[PDB]
Design a protein around this ligand. Structure first.
Ligand code: F6C
Ligand code: CLA
Ligand code: CLA
Ligand code: CLA
Ligand code: CLA
Ligand code: CLA
Ligand code: CLA
Ligand code: CLA
Ligand code: CLA
Ligand SMILES: CC1=C(/C=C/C(C)=C/C=C/C(C)=C/C=C/C=C(C)/C=C/C=C(C)/C=C/C2=C(C)CCCC2(C)C)C(C)(C)CCC1
Ligand code: SF4
Ligand SMILES: [Ca+2]
Lengths: 75, 31, 74, 172, 42, 80, 139, 753, 42
């Protein structure tokens, strides 16, 4: 059978936003070389490259999470 | 239906891994 | 024969040296050469390769000559 | 600036000599490998050369019978397969013992060449005397014949031994 | 039949050889190994 | 051992001595050439027969000649 | 005995064999101005010490190649010596034979195996039949 | 800031003056010729750039410019195939009747009777039947008329001119610095996300928007003229909606992560299309789309200019004891530290790795394209299927040998002992006697227990004792591990239970699950493995291991050995070190490549022979109305391939009937080339068996005759050098043997395929 | 019968023993004799 994919709803927006946010806090404190290049609070003051990397990885991880949940009936 | 010939042989080969590690731990504790 | 005629000595001498090391370092191998093993000489290899080439030449055609005639006739 | 880091090297030079063409590995120098190899009959301390040959012969003659019994050309019949296996072990061991004899004849003339010379320090080849080799050979031959015959007797009596190991001899 | 030891389980030949090996073949060599270990001079 | 001979056509260019991988040759005083020296082979027992000396010799024909002879442990280049 | 401390080397399979203990062995000793990395004659890299060094080698060609192509050409070290060590302990210094490098002419060195003619004047082998004399050895 | 573009301006003037100075790149060759050896040396050192100069920056610029030249050559070759398929082919006729028309794209002129080679290939066309699979590739791309092929031919010529201009521009006008070439992280990011990733994405777009709709109509049976042009599927969205309903809702599901609604054209079926026998194009579209995402993600892995990413140097410096797994700590306390120096300066080391992986890729291409035929009407075109597997097997073998060759070149030329102190490279060289001795032993074990068992079979069969043979009816050698894998992979899709539930059909029918037939011929069916397959696979293991032994001994001993300790000073390519030390012929690392070429040829010849016989015997054939399959050789492989008398009789003698009887027919060219390959093989034997000392002396007498008549040349004739004679021998040997097999394979398949 | 090696010639038992003797019984002792001969110290 074709794995189930759900229609767009605020829940998938919450998952993607939360995954992007959590990655942003973790990356600014764990990656080897943050604050490299042009600069953009509670965060570690990440650079532009760190922020775009966090948002891109938030889309990557978030997309995997939403498709994984929707496949299994929310895991 | 019980396990087959291959399953018994696989278990025997797998049991070698804790067998060798048991020897390593025993000799290390003897030190 | 193609092996003895195409490959030449220095390749085999280096390989034999590796096997010499292996024998010396292997336990339970109580044997030991009284004559040091070396690759066949340059001239010797040409003769040995020529011998294999000739013997194969004669044996192959001899078998074909007999079979293709005796099999078809008396 | 230069750090060979030999002190933290898992693989050390063999016996502290970096120029002896050897390494200290799990195969050559681990406590288990040394214990197993040095206590084989070829290396066990204190063994007489005849007793070294006896234990080696019994072990080798015993298993040499097997191959021709199972996949040999007389395998179609039980009795023929067993005889062929015993003969093959006898032929191989007699040939090997002949090789051991002529090895001792040719090696030990004057000061032997190679690893059996007086000044040689080959720890893997400890039988440095001609009389030791002949004592070894006598043990090898008698042990190999005994081991081959022992395997032959067990295979010849396979039907009896199968009933033995299943308790079928306790019916009467 | 019930005149002999048999096994309907897979690889029933295994107890045929393992019982002799563990109980009256290997134990004497094992005792020999332990005896050498406990008698070795310092 | 191999035999190494030096003929009177030598010009004392020392090329053969430099090319020898086992130090078989050395340069000795001489008066037959402008360089006032000639090649010598005092240590032919160490000669392996590589003929590197002949390759380096500039004279025509060669002033140094190697004749392969009886083979020994060191003439065969055996480390065992 | 030969003095000097061996270079840093973790071991290898290109070292000495039974021939070293049974027939003969060679040792190359030298002095270097600093600690530096060189290539072993039979593969691998070794670190030569600050003071005087001593390396055990299976063949004489190893010492000539190491001393000539590496010690002199690359490290500008010219005081290296090569010894032949016999199993009974006898040691003789063989390179340089008389303290002067062979490529440099030295007084007192005799002519060895010199033929007083051109190579084209060697006699034909037919004239020396059954005499046991090779054409290049003919007077 | 670290990654930046720096170039020189006009570093080399563009003048043809040096065109009239042959050998200018070499100091020795620049003086001019004195003997004929100068001519050979000029061509031998033409592209050895590291011997033209010692400047790494100048060398790298030559690499970059020359690569553009090779790309232009490939584009001209690609343009030729498209043009010949648009002007001198029966492509349009073949597209109408794929199962009844032989592809043909080469037409010969009629001057000396060679027009007999214009075979009756069907479709009212006369020409040489091609086996390259161009027609099947173009059909899968959606090409339906010769005009589209003509346009691609013009585009290929344009790209060739652009490639040629780029090489001139980046060498004579704007040559990048050495630091530009040393940007590992930037190069990896751009070639992963931008080259592989964007190319997969672009081809996925072409497949989705062009190939899938055109091929869906083609398999439905509608005529070529009734199929709209591919751009109509883009403009008229209603046309795409009818074929795939999901296209009626646009890009909304993609941006909302509702990708499950795209399942109608991004399928995950597996198996083969019943109509054509190739893979489902919708399956390949999802395959390439998934590849594009994976490659683009991989392209953000390395740190270029923004701190984010991984560093090559930090990984290599960290991969050492005790940071490895407990059983992998034997690599020592230095480990991979120092390997980064190799990739900074050694072009040869990188070429060694890349040539090896092109061998790996081409081998995967050969194996994965017959068992999972990706093009329509490719599996049932037996001539094309055999040719494609054989061609890409041979390409891989040459690439692998080249990888070993340039690995040895790196050791002699670029290896620096100071950079490798107790690291893994140094440690590997320090136990090379361990490695070679064990490899030599396993080669002997494999040779005895693979080939000598065939000799055992021949002797038993001649004795009239078939029961004693290694066969399915005698002493069986069942490849149980390979049989088990076939069962696991078949049961994975539902045909250790159902481990790939989403796949409908078996991934490959070669593992089981059923048979596919297209035009009354077998496309793919399960390939049973028995004793004969056990024996032949261990033949491959034996031949590969020996080829490894020859090449890997040369690389490990390139610097020297116990015999010649200073081989590195002698160089990568030298004939010997004299007759001393008993004789040191062929000690150089080059000679190990020379010997390894023969063993690669021997290994790969048996690989393509195994494929040709097994596929004909057990897979390929015709299917009647009742579903009964009669194979091309009728199942000879199981009983005949267990002896090499069977190989000699039932494979070489029997299957050469087509090529040997091809005279006075359209296949007569294959018969001529069959003899041509045999001639070159025998011709090569005098270069391999003889030496230049004989030939130089013979040339002396010939030169005397020319001197007698005052016609002797100033450029003195010389016999080929010792290395050159070996190179000629191996080149003619491989050419003769491969051409012989090429004619043997193609003549038979063009007649019975 | 043609299920075994036989001989209608006189003394057909001779190949029954000579073939084993010359080809796999005596050759190893002969090789041993030659090996001793060629390895003898001067
Ligand atoms: C004498 C004694 C001795 C000894 C002991 O003591 C030995 C030992 C070893 C070890 C260590 C090892 C493992 C084993 C195997 O697996 O392989 C083999 C097999 C066999 C079978 C071998 C054989 C054994 C013995 C010889 C036995 C004998 C017995 C008989 C029976 C006698 C008979 C007599 C009569 C009279 C005939 C080896 C080896 C090698 N080899 Mg080696 N040996 C020797 C001898 C010889 C000779 C003569 C030659 C020449 C031909 C060679 C050769 C060779 C090569 C190529 C190689 C290889 O590769 C390998 C290796 O390294 O790896 C790694 N090698 N070795
Ligand atoms: C995304 C960027 C990108 C892309 C696509 C490439 C692609 C390529 N590089 Mg490359 N490179 C890049 C960035 C890139 N590079 C960067 C940033 C550096 C500096 C670190 C290098 C440094 C470099 C070196 C040093 C070398 C290459 C080489 C190559 C070629 C390898 C041969 C091959 O696979 O043939 C692929 C075959 C093709 C036909 C691909 C198409 C070729 C053209 C030029 C691509 C044009 C794409 C462009 C976007 C236009 C698209 C139009 C349309 C699709 C929209 C290939 C064309 C090698 C080579 O052969 O040089 C000539 C080589 O030696 N590259
Ligand atoms: C990407 C691929 C690639 C690249 C860039 C190189 C690059 C290089 N290789 Mg290399 N090589 C490769 C693949 C590659 N190789 C492969 C696959 C092999 C295995 C066969 C080799 C084997 C190899 C050897 C053994 C040697 C090199 C050498 C060299 C260097 C000098 C080039 C040279 O001699 O000009 C080539 C000049 C020629 C005259 C060759 C042309 C003659 C060929 C053999 C004719 C082929 C016949 C034809 C295809 C079919 C018949 C034609 C018809 C008319 C009958 C250069 C760095 C040489 C060197 O010194 O390296 C430092 C060297 O000794 N390579
Ligand atoms: C944390 C939430 C979460 C959950 C519940 C899942 C769940 C799943 N993922 Mg998934 N994934 C996640 C996060 C998650 N993922 C993240 C963060 C990423 C990184 C972007 C991915 C990347 C990913 C890929 C690339 C794939 C999956 C696949 C799958 C499915 C595999 C089915 C199975 O049992 O295979 C069992 C497999 C083995 C035992 C082997 C499953 C529904 C696969 C899929 O599509 O299957 C339907 C697939 O190809 N996931
Ligand atoms: C601790 C667990 C345990 C115990 C108590 C037993 C008990 C028994 N097994 Mg057994 N077995 C086990 C685990 C165990 N099994 C496992 C995991 C396997 C799969 C590898 C097997 C495979 C197996 C076979 C194939 C056979 C038996 C048989 C037997 C019986 C005779 C003994 C024998 O031949 O041993 C044989 C033992 C092995 C082949 C391997 C044993 C491996 C275990 C894990 C070792 C345990 C060591 C222990 C924990 C350390 C003790 C410490 C000390 C201080 C006491 C006996 C009832 C025989 C039988 O059925 O007779 C009727 C027989 O033929 N066993
Ligand atoms: C995993 C890689 C992969 C695979 C399996 C395929 C598979 C396929 N492609 Mg495809 N392709 C790929 C990558 C891949 N592609 C890339 C990267 C590009 C360019 C960006 C393309 C461009 C392309 C075009 C333009 C076309 C195809 C087509 C096809 C189909 C025909 C069969 C074929 O090409 O041989 C299958 C190939 C293989 C099995 C092996 C090659 C894959 C690479 C080279 C191996 C790389 C791994 C390497 C050995 C290890 C690297 C070292 C490691 C340390 C990482 C088939 C479905 C044709 C089509 O439409 O079919 C209907 C077609 O016209 N492909
Ligand atoms: C990477 C190359 C590539 C390119 C150039 C295009 C280009 C196009 N796509 Mg497309 N597409 C691609 C890959 C690509 N696609 C892939 C990989 C998928 C699968 C997710 C799709 C799925 C897709 C859909 C579902 C649709 C398009 C449509 C379109 C057209 C309008 C899109 C727009 O402007 O918004 C345009 C011609 C739309 C269109 O006009 O259909 C013809 C449309 O409905 N595409
Ligand atoms: C058919 C011809 C032939 C044969 C049989 C061999 C055999 C061998 N080659 Mg070889 N070679 C050949 C042609 C051949 N080569 C050619 C043409 C070339 C040129 C390219 C080479 C180049 C070459 C190289 C470069 C290398 C070899 C290696 C090897 C050895 C591989 C190990 C092996 O298989 O051991 C098993 C031995 C065999 C399979 C030989 C056949 C044995 C028969 C079938 C059984 C005999 C039974 C019994 C012992 C007979 C005794 C009776 C008594 C009366 C004599 C082996 C000795 C490699 C090596 O030495 O690796 C260790 C190696 O490095 N060869
Ligand atoms: C050179 C002559 C010659 C040759 C080639 C053969 C060949 C053969 N004989 Mg034979 N034979 C010969 C003379 C010869 N015979 C003579 C003169 C006699 C009478 C004494 C016999 C009596 C004889 C018997 C009784 C038997 C054979 C058998 C055989 C076959 C197996 C070999 C064997 O068992 O030898 C056995 C050989 C002998 C018992 C004595 C041989 C005496 C000859 C003169 C020795 C010649 C030595 C030779 C000249 C020196 C070679 C030098 C070297 C450099 C090559 C074989 C076809 C056997 C057979 O038929 O198998 C089917 C068998 O059972 N032979
Ligand atoms: C290393 C090891 C191993 C192996 C082992 C082996 C290899 C074994 C073998 C074993 C064997 C192979 C054994 C054998 C034995 C034998 C015996 C025990 C015998 C005895 C004998 C006898 C007792 C005899 C007697 C006699 C005589 C003397 C004379 C008269 C007659 C008679 C018969 C009485 C394993 C893998 C497991 C594990 C790991 C480790
Ligand atoms: S035969 Fe040729 S390759 Fe061999 S040593 Fe003599 S010159 Fe060199
Ligand atoms: Ca009873």
């Amino acid at each position: 059978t074709v794995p189930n994919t759900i229609s767009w709803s605020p829940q998938v927006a919450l998952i993607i936003s939360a995954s992007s946010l959590l990655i942003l806090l973790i990356a600014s404190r764990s990656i080897k070389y943050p604050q490299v290049g042009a600069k953009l609070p509670v965060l570690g003051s990440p650079s532009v490259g760190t922020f775009v990397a966090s948002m891109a990885f938030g889309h990557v991880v978030g997309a995997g999470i939403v498709l994984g949940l929707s496949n299994l009936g929310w895991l | 239906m019980n396990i087959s010939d291959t399953q018994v042989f696989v278990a025997l080969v797998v049991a070698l891994l804790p067998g060798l590690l048991a020897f390593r731990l025993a000799t290390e504790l003897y030190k | 024969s193609f092996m003895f005629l195409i490959t030449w000595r220095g390749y085999w001498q280096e390989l034999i040296e590796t096997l010499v090391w292996a024998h010396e370092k292997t336990p339970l191998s109580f044997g030991y050469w009284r004559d040091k093993p070396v690759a066949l000489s340059i001239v010797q290899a040409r003769l040995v390769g020529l011998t294999h080439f000739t013997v194969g030449y004669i044996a192959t055609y001899g078998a074909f000559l007999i079979a293709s005639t005796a099999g078809k006739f008396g | 600036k230069l750090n060979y880091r030999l002190d933290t090297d898992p693989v050390q030079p063999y016996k502290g000599d970096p120029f002896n063409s050897n390494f200290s590995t799990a195969i050559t120098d681990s406590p288990l490998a040394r214990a197993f190899i040095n206590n084989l009959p070829a290396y066990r301390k204190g063994l007489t050369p005849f007793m070294r040959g006896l234990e080696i012969g019994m072990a080798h003659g015993y298993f040499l019978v097997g191959p021709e019994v199972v996949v040999g050309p007389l395998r179609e019949t039980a009795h023929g397969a067993n005889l062929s296996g015993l003969i093959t072990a006898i032929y191989i061991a007699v040939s090997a013992c002949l090789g051991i004899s002529i090895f001792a004849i040719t090696t030990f003339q004057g000061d032997p060449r190679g690893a059996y010379g007086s000044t040689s320090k080959d720890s893997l080849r400890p039988l440095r005397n001609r009389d030791e080799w002949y004592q070894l050979n006598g043990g090898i031959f008698l042990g190999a014949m005994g081991g081959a015959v022992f395997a032959y007797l067990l295979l010849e009596n396979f039907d009896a031994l199968d009933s033995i190991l299943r308790g079928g001899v306790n019916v009467n | 039949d019930m005149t002999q030891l048999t096994g309907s389980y897979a690889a029933s030949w295994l107890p045929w050889i393992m019982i002799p090996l563990i109980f009256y073949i290997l134990p004497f060599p094992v005792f020999a190994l332990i005896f050498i270990w406990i008698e070795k001079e310092a | 051992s191999h035999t190494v001979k030096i003929y009177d056509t030598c010009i004392g260019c020392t090329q053969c001595v430099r090319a020898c991988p086992t130090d078989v040759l050395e340069m000795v005083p001489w008066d037959g050439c402008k360089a006032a020296q000639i090649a010598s082979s005092p240590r032919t027992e160490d000669c392996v027969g590589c003929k590197r000396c002949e390759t380096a010799c500039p004279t025509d024909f060669l002033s140094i000649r190697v004749y392969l002879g009886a083979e020994t442990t060191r003439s065969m280049g055996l480390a065992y | 005995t030969l003095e000097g401390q061996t270079p840093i080397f973790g071991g290898g399979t290109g070292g000495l064999l039974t021939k070293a203990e049974r027939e003969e062995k060679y040792v190359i000793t030298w002095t270097s101005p600093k600690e530096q990395v060189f290539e072993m004659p039979t593969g691998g890299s070794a670190i030569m010490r600050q003071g005087k060094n001593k390396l055990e080698i299976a063949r004489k060609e190893y010492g000539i190649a190491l001393g000539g192509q590496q010690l002199r050409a690359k490290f500008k070290i010219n005081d290296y010596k090569i010894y032949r060590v016999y199993p009974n302990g006898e040691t003789q210094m063989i390179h340089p034979a008389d303290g002067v490098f062979p490529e440099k002419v030295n007084q007192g060195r005799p002519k060895v195996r010199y033929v007083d003619r051109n190579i084209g004047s060697n006699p034909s082998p037919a004239k020396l039949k059954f005499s046991g004399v090779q054409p290049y050895d003919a007077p | 800031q670290k990654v930046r573009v720096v170039v020189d301006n006009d570093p080399v003037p563009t003048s043809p003056e040096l065109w009239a100075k042959p050998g200018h790149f070499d100091r020795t060759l620049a003086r001019g010729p004195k003997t004929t050896t100068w001519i050979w040396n000029l061509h031998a050192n033409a592209h050895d750039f590291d011997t033209h100069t010692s400047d790494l920056e100048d060398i790298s610029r030559k690499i970059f410019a020359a690569h553009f030249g090779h790309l232009a050559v490939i584009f001209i070759w690609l343009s030729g195939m498209y043009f010949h398929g648009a002007k001198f082919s029966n492509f349009e006729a073949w597209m109408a009747n794929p199962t009844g028309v032989k592809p043909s794209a080469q037409v010969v002129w009629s001057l000396v009777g060679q027009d007999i080679l214009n075979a009756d290939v069907g479709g009212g066309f006369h020409g040489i039947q091609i086996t390259s699979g161009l027609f099947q590739l173009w059909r899968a791309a959606g090409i339906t008329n010769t005009f589209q092929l003509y346009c691609t031919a013009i585009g290929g010529l344009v790209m060739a001119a652009i490639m040629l201009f780029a090489g001139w521009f980046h060498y004579h006008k704007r040559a990048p610095k050495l630091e530009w070439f040393q940007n590992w992280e930037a190069m990896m990011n751009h070639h992963l996300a931008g080259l592989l990733g964007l190319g997969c994405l672009g081809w996925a777009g072409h497949q989705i928007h062009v190939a899938l709709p055109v091929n869906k109509l083609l398999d439905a049976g509608v005529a070529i003229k009734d199929i709209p042009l591919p751009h109509e599927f883009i403009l008229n969205t209603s046309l795409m909606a009818e074929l795939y309903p999901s296209f009626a809702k646009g890009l909304v599901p993609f941006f909302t992560l509702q990708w499950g609604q795209y399942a109608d054209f991004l399928t995950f079926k597996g198996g083969l299309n019943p109509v054509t026998g190739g893979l489902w194009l919708s399956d390949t579209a999802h395959h390439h789309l998934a590849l594009a995402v994976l490659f683009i993600v991989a392209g953000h892995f390395y740190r270029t200019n923004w701190g984010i990413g991984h560093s090559f140097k930090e990984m290599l410096d960290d991969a050492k004891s005790p940071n490895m797994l407990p059983f992998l700590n034997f690599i020592g306390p230095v480990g991979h530290e120092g390997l980064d120096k190799i990739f900074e300066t050694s072009w040869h080391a990188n070429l060694s790795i890349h040539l090896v992986q092109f061998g790996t890729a081409s081998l995967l291409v050969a194996h994965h394209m017959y068992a999972m035929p990706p093009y329509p009407y490719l599996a049932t075109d037996y001539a094309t299927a055999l040719s494609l597997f054989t061609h890409h097997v041979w390409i891989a073998g040459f690439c692998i040998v080249g990888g070993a060759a340039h690995a040895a070149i790196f050791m002699v030329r670029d290896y620096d002992p100071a950079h490798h102190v107790n690291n893994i490279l140094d440690r590997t060289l320090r136990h090379r006697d361990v490695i070679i001795s064990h490899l030599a032993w396993v080669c002997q074990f494999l040779g005895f227990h693979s080939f000598a068992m065939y000799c055992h079979n021949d002797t038993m069969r001649a004795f009239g004792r078939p029961q004693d043979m290694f066969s399915d009816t005698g002493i069986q050698l069942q490849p149980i591990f390979a049989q088990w894998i076939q069962h696991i992979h078949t049961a994975a899709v539902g045909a250790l239970g159902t481990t790939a539930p989403g796949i409908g059909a078996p991934v490959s029918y070669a593992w089981g699950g059923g048979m596919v037939a297209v035009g009354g011929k077998v496309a793919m069916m399960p390939i049973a493995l028995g004793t004969a397959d056990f024996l032949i696979h261990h033949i491959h293991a034996f031949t590969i291991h020996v080829t490894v032994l020859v090449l890997f001994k040369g690389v490990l001993f390139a610097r020297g050995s116990r015999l010649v300790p200073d081989k590195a000073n002698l160089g990568f390519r030298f004939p010997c070190d004299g007759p001393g030390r008993g004789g040191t012929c062929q000690v150089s690392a080059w000679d190990h490549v020379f010997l390894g070429l023969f063993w690669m040829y021997n290994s790969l010849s048996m690989v393509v022979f195994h494929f040709s016989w097994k596929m004909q015997s057990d897979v390929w054939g015709t299917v009647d109305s009742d579903g009964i399959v009669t194979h091309l050789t009728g199942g000879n492989f199981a009983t005949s391939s267990i002896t090499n008398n069977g190989w000699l009789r039932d494979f070489l003698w029997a299957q050469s009937a087509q090529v040997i009887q091809s005279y006075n027919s359209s296949l007569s060219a294959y018969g001529l080339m069959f003899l041509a390959g045999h001639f070159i093989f025998g011709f090569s034997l005098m270069f391999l068996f003889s030496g230049r000392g004989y030939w130089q002396e013979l040339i002396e007498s010939i030169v005397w005759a020319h001197n007698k008549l005052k016609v002797a040349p100033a450029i003195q004739p010389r016999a080929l050098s010792i290395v050159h004679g070996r190179a000629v021998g191996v080149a003619h040997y491989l050419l003769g043997g491969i051409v012989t097999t090429w004619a043997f394979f193609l003549a038979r398949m063009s007649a019975i395929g």
